């Protein structure tokens, strides 16, 4: 049949031509395969006619062809199917529709989108959406939704930007246009540049997102929440989202049993919790226990990380709200979880402990939560974040505390205990870890607990390790042209001397 369809097209008479176009429309409409260049060429001849019927059939046929991957790649080569798109400007509204359709179906491929971004084709695509009929607007919002995929593609979305059209279209009651729009804006808010322009360009956009956080459609809910997160990548919006009362929506989106919504909501709340000013509000809202229990489930580590991180920034921002932080037992649960969870969750928990262990107000409480039962083994970790942070926390917990009981308890056990820790970190050739060990030993001696003094002063291994550290640093400093009286070496040496002064 292609021989008859081709010969029927080239006639130059309108009637055979509308016949051909209809045929093409149906045969493309229910079976879609890989097809040759020769089939494509007639369509190009078909494409330019100014009987509208001919392009509704031709543009529907061609638009139908789009779903198979090959046709879209094939479309770019001709140089092309592009002239028809320029034709889309002419008013006839339903071939406006179908042309926009093919272009919406087309450009899914990146080069396509990059290619489309050239030639100033998309100034019409931004134009197309407003037209009253849902059909053409769905394609228009669909089309650049598809073009919001590459960075510089969205960078020519803002050139001749339809962005105002988008934020206004967020309030559409038609489900799919508004979804296409939320997803478009969400995809745009990935760039720092776009985020900075969006604050003073088309302002009040975020409030619309917050409203969309209560859509009956799950898709709109999720994607809007993710949009809000992407905006909350910056501090401006970190505060601005909170201003719009996005807290209750998020606070309960989290125990939703639809896991994607949970992921989105916890991601968002984490990003906004970055800002210290927010902490108060976030804690007063009942976020804590939901976050706490949410992190425990095994299957999705990403939620675990978002939750632990949220907890960590809440803890890091203010010593407000700290026994308000204690009550949940999440710290008990972070303790239980740190020993048996992915290295991601581990490093997050690690940084969290290191953060909590700074405030002197909570050192004792952390110690009587037997946190050393997790901190000590964590210092063994091959992962530098885990071992490092655990070590820092442990070191801080030995410094200027009002009761040294739990430390004396954790001297030997578990995992060779604090003693083992000190020896290990001295024997490392990591300057940081050497420093942590020496510093901790000094902090212990500088406590006026006699028992601790006697454990440190009688431990031959620890005493020997400090002595060799002192010698090593002394000779590094004497090879480099320095007599005492890198920059780490001097510091380390000084600490060794302060420690060794306790011996006599």
């Amino acid at each position: 049949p292609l021989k008859a369809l081709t010969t029927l097209v080239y006639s130059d008479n309108l009637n055979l031509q509308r016949s051909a176009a209809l045929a093409f429309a149906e045969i493309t409409e229910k079976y879609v395969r890989q097809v040759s260049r020769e089939v494509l060429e007639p369509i190009l001849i078909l494409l330019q006619s100014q009987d509208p019927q001919i392009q509704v059939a031709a543009c529907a046929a061609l638009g139908n062809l789009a779903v198979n991957n090959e046709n879209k790649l094939l479309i770019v080569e001709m140089g092309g199917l592009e002239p028809l798109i320029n034709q889309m400007m002419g008013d006839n509204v339903e071939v406006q529709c179908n042309a926009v359709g093919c272009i919406t179906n087309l450009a899914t491929r990146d080069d396509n989108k990059h290619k489309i971004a050239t030639s100033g084709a998309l100034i019409p695509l931004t134009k197309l959406a407003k037209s009253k009929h849902i059909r053409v607007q769905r394609n228009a919002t669909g089309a650049l939704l598809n073009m919001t995929h590459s960075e510089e593609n969205r960078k020519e979305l803002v050139n001749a930007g339809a962005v105002p059209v988008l934020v206004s279209l967020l309030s559409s009651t038609d489900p799919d246009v508004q979804y296409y729009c939320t997803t478009a804006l969400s995809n745009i808010a990935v760039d720092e540049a776009n985020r900075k322009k969006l604050a003073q360009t088309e302002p009040r956009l975020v409030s619309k997102l917050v409203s969309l956080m209560d859509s009956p459609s799950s898709r709109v809910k999720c994607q809007a929440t993710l949009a809000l997160r992407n905006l909350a990548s910056d501090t401006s919006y970190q505060l601005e989202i909170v201003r719009a009362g996005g807290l209750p929506h998020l606070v309960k989106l989290i125990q939703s049993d639809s896991i994607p919504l949970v992921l989105a909501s916890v991601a968002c709340i984490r990003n906004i919790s970055i800002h210290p000013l927010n902490e108060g509000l976030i804690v007063d809202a009942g976020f804590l226990k939901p976050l706490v229990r949410l992190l425990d489930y095994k299957d999705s580590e990403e939620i675990q990380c978002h939750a632990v991180s949220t907890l960590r920034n809440l803890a890091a921002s203010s010593e407000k709200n700290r026994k308000e932080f204690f009550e949940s037992g999440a710290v008990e649960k972070c303790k239980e979880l740190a020993l048996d969870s992915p290295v991601s969750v581990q490093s997050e928990i690690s940084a969290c402990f290191a953060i909590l262990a700074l405030a002197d107000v909570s050192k004792l409480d952390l110690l009587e939560a037997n946190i050393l039962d997790a901190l000590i083994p964590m210092t063994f970790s091959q992962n530098q974040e885990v071992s490092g942070n655990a070590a820092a926390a442990l070191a801080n917990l030995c410094s200027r505390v009002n009761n040294y009981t739990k430390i004396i308890e954790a001297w030997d056990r578990p995992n060779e205990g604090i003693r083992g820790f000190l020896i290990r970190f001295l024997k490392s050739d990591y300057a940081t870890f050497e420093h942590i060990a020496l510093w901790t030993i000094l902090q212990l001696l500088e406590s006026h607990n006699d028992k601790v003094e006697d454990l440190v002063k009688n431990d031959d291994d620890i005493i020997n390790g400090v002595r060799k550290m002192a010698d090593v640093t002394f000779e590094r400093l004497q090879r480099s042209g320095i007599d005492v009286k890198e920059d780490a070496s001097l510091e380390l040496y000084n600490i060794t001397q302060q420690i060794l002064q306790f011996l006599h």
């Binding site: 409409e29 509704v56 529907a60 638009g63 139908n64 789009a66 779903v67 339903e94 529709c97 179908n98 926009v100 359709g101 093919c102 919406t104 179906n105 899914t108 059909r135 769905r138 394609n139 919002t141 669909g142 089309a143 939704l145 598809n146 919001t148 995929h149 296409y180 997803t183 969400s186 995809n187 808010a189 990935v190 994607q223 993710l226 997160r229 992407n230 990548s233 991601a267 990403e302 990380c305 978002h306 991180s309 991601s344 490093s347 997050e348 690690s350 940084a351 290191a354 530098q384 974040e385 490092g388 942070n389």
Partner: peptide, 21 residues
């Protein structure tokens, strides 16, 4: 060290596809 997991903004994977009459 403090870790940074899943910190970057997300680009939605969904792409639209057109409808005809």
């Amino acid at each position: 060290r403090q870790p940074y997991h899943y910190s970057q903004p997300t680009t939605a994977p969904f792409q639209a596809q057109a409808k005809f009459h």
